[PDB]
Amino acid sequence: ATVQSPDGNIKIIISDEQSTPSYSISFKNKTVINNSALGFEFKQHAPFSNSFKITKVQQQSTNTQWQQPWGERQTVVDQHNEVTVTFAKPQPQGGTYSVRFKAFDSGVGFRYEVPKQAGLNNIEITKELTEFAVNNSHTATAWWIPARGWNRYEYVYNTTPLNDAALVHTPFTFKNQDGVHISIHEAALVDYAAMVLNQRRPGVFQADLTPWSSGVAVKKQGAFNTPWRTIQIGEKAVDLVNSDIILNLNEPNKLGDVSWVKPGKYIGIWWGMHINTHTWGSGDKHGATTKNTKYYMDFAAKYGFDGVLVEGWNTGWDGDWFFNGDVFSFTQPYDDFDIAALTKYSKQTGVQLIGHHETSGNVSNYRKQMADAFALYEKSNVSQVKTGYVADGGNIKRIDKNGIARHEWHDGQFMVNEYLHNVKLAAKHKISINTHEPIKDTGLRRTYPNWITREGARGQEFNAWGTPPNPPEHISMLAFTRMLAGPMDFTPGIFDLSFNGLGANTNRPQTTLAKQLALYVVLYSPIQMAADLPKNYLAKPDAFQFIQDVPTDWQQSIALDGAVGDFIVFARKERKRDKYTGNDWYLGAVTDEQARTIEISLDFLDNGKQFEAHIYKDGKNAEWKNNPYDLTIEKRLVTASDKLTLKLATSGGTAIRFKALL
Numbered sequence: 001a002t003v004q005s006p007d008g009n010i011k012i013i014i015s016d017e018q019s020t021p022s023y024s025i026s027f028k029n030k031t032v033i034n035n036s037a038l039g040f041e042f043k044q045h046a047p048f049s050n051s052f053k054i055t056k057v058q059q060q061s062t063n064t065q066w067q068q069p070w071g072e073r074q075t076v077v078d079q080h081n082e083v084t085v086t087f088a089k090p091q092p093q094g095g096t097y098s099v100r101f102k103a104f105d106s107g108v109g110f111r112y113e114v115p116k117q118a119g120l121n122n123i124e125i126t127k128e129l130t131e132f133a134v135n136n137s138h139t140a141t142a143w144w145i146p147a148r149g150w151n152r153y154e155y156v157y158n159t160t161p162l163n164d165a166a167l168v169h170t171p172f173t174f175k176n177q178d179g180v181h182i183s184i185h186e187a188a189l190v191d192y193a194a195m196v197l198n199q200r201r202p203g204v205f206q207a208d209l210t211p212w213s214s215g216v217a218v219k220k221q222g223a224f225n226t227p228w229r230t231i232q233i234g235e236k237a238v239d240l241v242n243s244d245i246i247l248n249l250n251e252p253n254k255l256g257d258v259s260w261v262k263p264g265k266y267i268g269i270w271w272g273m274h275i276n277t278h279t280w281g282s283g284d285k286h287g288a289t290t291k292n293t294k295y296y297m298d299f300a301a302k303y304g305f306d307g308v309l310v311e312g313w314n315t316g317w318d319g320d321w322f323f324n325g326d327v328f329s330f331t332q333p334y335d336d337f338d339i340a341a342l343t344k345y346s347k348q349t350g351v352q353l354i355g356h357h358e359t360s361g362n363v364s365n366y367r368k369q370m371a372d373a374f375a376l377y378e379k380s381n382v383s384q385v386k387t388g389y390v391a392d393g394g395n396i397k398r399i400d401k402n403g404i405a406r407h408e409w410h411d412g413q414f415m416v417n418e419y420l421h422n423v424k425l426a427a428k429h430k431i432s433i434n435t436h437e438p439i440k441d442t443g444l445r446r447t448y449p450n451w452i453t454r455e456g457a458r459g460q461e462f463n464a465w466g467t468p469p470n471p472p473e474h475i476s477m478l479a480f481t482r483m484l485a486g487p488m489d490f491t492p493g494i495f496d497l498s499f500n501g502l503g504a505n506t507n508r509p510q511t512t513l514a515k516q517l518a519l520y521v522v523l524y525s526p527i528q529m530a531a532d533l534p535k536n537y538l539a540k541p542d543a544f545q546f547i548q549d550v551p552t553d554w555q556q557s558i559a560l561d562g563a564v565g566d567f568i569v570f571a572r573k574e575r576k577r578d579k580y581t582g583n584d585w586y587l588g589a590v591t592d593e594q595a596r597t598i599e600i601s602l603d604f605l606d607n608g609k610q611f612e613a614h615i616y617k618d619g620k621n622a623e624w625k626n627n628p629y630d631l632t633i634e635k636r637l638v639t640a641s642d643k644l645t646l647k648l649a650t651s652g653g654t655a656i657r658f659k660a661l662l
């Protein structure tokens with residue numbers, strides 16, 4: 001059986017001649033994915049492996065478009081060809097299952113659909129046999145983070161030969177020697193275990209499902225489907241970025257009117273704890289006080305921020321909070337945090353309190369208080385909540401039905417369901433969720449638009465204490481790996497880079513100032529933090545103007561140019577909403593450890609319109625180690641027929657507002 005992308009360049013052949021059912025993929029008539037197995041092993045049920053034959057193929061196709069409530073673009077086009085391939089094995093130990101393939105011009109998605117059948121009752125998947133056999137893996141290059149490690153998704157990316165990527169998280173991005181870029185991920189991860197990729201024979205990446213503590217991967221009753229497995233394929237690195245395949249593979253919005261989900265910018269009592277000017281726990285340096293929160297709300301009201309995150313407001317942080325998962329209260333504030341007073345102040349100032357639920361990994365203590373916690377927040381005019389699950393890999397703590405503690409993975413079926421329960425319950429309170437230490441993004445924001453963002457990668461916080469901090473190449477790695485999954489709460493915008501000293505050997509963002517501004521356009525998120533202490537913004541008001549101006553919701557986005565681990569350039573057009581007319585374009589560019597010159601056409605600008613470019617760029621002598629603050633801000637009239645030369649300093653960047661005139 002064969003299905004092809006609409007343009008014909010991606011061709012998938014589904015076969016039953018190998019020991020198992022299998023598939024392979026060519027791009028422009030060169031094989032990029034060799035014969036790759038399909039099937040399942042179960043704890044008790046007989047396997048779905050060899051001796052299955054194709055009995056039926058059903059072809060259909062889609063050419064439609066839909067509108068996002070918020071996002072990186074307003075209109076999403078869905079054009080694909082589809083085939084459902086049915087496999088059957090005769091008894092004894094027979095069975096049937098289908099695999100549905102969707103072929104887009106930018107990649108392919110497939111999932112298993114196992115129908116109701118005799119003897120398929122309570123089953124436990126112990127292995128998914130799905131492979132991704134990369135052709136010519138010995139000359140391919142990969143950029144990846146390890147899976148099943150103690151620090152979850154929070155690793156810097158490795159640059160290695162593909163054959164050295166032994167056990168990896170997704171999105172898993174690599175290029176072959178032809179320069180074709182490929183990224184493997186999944187979409188609509190619901191009631192199932194996350195897929196890790198386990199390289200078996202060289203180049204053969206086998207699905208490795210993150211298990212329950214008991215050892216099985218997925219518990220199902222009767223007929224079931226898997227999430228989608230996704231393979232993005234493009235001639236250029238930016239072709240991976242500019243695809244909507246992850247969103248297109250998710251179910252449509254199930255929450256109805258979601259106008260109560262508000263993209264915007266926020267600040268927080270937050271960074272001070274990370275740089276040790278404040279504590280989460282009580283005492284003379286406690287961050288979360290009524291006085292401090294009101295001071296931040298005043299700043300937010302004056303400078304155009306929608307909300308103030310406050311961490312450490314609830315009892316349970318005293319001592320070593322990493323170990324306090326059992327004792328956190330999610331309803332009882334510290335005595336110096338007056339939530340009724342701050343509720344009144346929120347209405348006075350128009351600035352909202354952003355809630356915070358850190359679990360330190362104990363999800364049962366959170367679950368038992370969750371309904372009361374969200375009721376308190378709804379009563380308190382809180383519309384967004386940041387959640388947290390700080391614990392080492394495999395050390396989520398739950399209490400089972402018999403009162404016995406079990407350790408689970410953040411990305412097993414148990415936690416996959418636990419996260420979605422939190423999001424769905426929050427939606428009943430008109431609360432949106434920003435998940436730290438999350439499950440990776442698989443596009444579920446389409447189905448549940450209050451799941452607005454997540455961390456799930458090393459963000460700005462590792463630049464306060466990472467030892468080492470994020471390297472100069474980190475952003476240009478994220479853009480082609482983590483950011484392919486969906487929005488990230490990176491908390492950009494650190495203006496004081498000197499709190500630990502300058503140079504290359506201290507814990508600090510290893511970037512220039514202009515690169516911090518560029519992050520607001522390079523790293524998409526519907527909520528963007530201005531992460532620094534307010535006084536540090538007041539010290540640099542001209543630079544701060546870009547953060548005040550920049551939107552977080554876009555009617556269109558285009559990655560114009562880039563290379564994994566080297567650089568990326570984004571142009572985005574603001575969505576018409578709130579103060580934003582919908583006429584301005586924005587650009588952000590960042591580089592890695594190397595200074596880079598990038599030539600950019602401005603032909604993304606609307607034809608026949610005049611713009612005033614407000615350009616924030618590295619100064620002539622800027623360099624991140626000892627001269628990160630040199631900055632030039634320039635105004636220049638431009639139209640779509642003009643061009644720009646970006647001159648990025650070492651770990652530098654450029655941010656531009658293209659202000660539409662009249």
Ligand SMILES: C[C@H]1O[C@H](O[C@H]2[C@H](O)[C@@H](O)[C@@H](O[C@H]3[C@H](O)[C@@H](O)[C@@H](O)O[C@@H]3CO)O[C@@H]2CO)[C@H](O)[C@@H](O)[C@@H]1N[C@H]1C=C(CO)[C@@H](O)[C@H](O)[C@H]1O
Pocket residue numbers: 151154270311358388390436437455461465466467468
């Ligand atoms: C807050 C942060 O905690 C976790 O990271 C911490 C490590 O678990 C600690 O072992 C500790 O080790 C670092 C050392 O400073 C240094 O010796 C280095 O060599 O190794 C470690 C760096 O990996 O320090 C870390 C921070 O204290 C956890 O992994 C991380 O994701 C947590 N971030 C969330 C927690 C809070 C509180 O709710 C929020 O403020 C953040 O925004 C969250 O993302």
Ligand SMILES: [Ca+2]
Pocket residue numbers: 436437455461
């Ligand atoms: Ca974190």
Ligand SMILES: [Cl-]
Pocket residue numbers: 151152153154436437438455456457
């Ligand atoms: Cl994580």
Ligand SMILES: [Cl-]
Pocket residue numbers: 463470471474475509510511
């Ligand atoms: Cl960084």
Ligand SMILES: [Mg+2]
Pocket residue numbers: 473564565566567592593
């Ligand atoms: Mg590089």
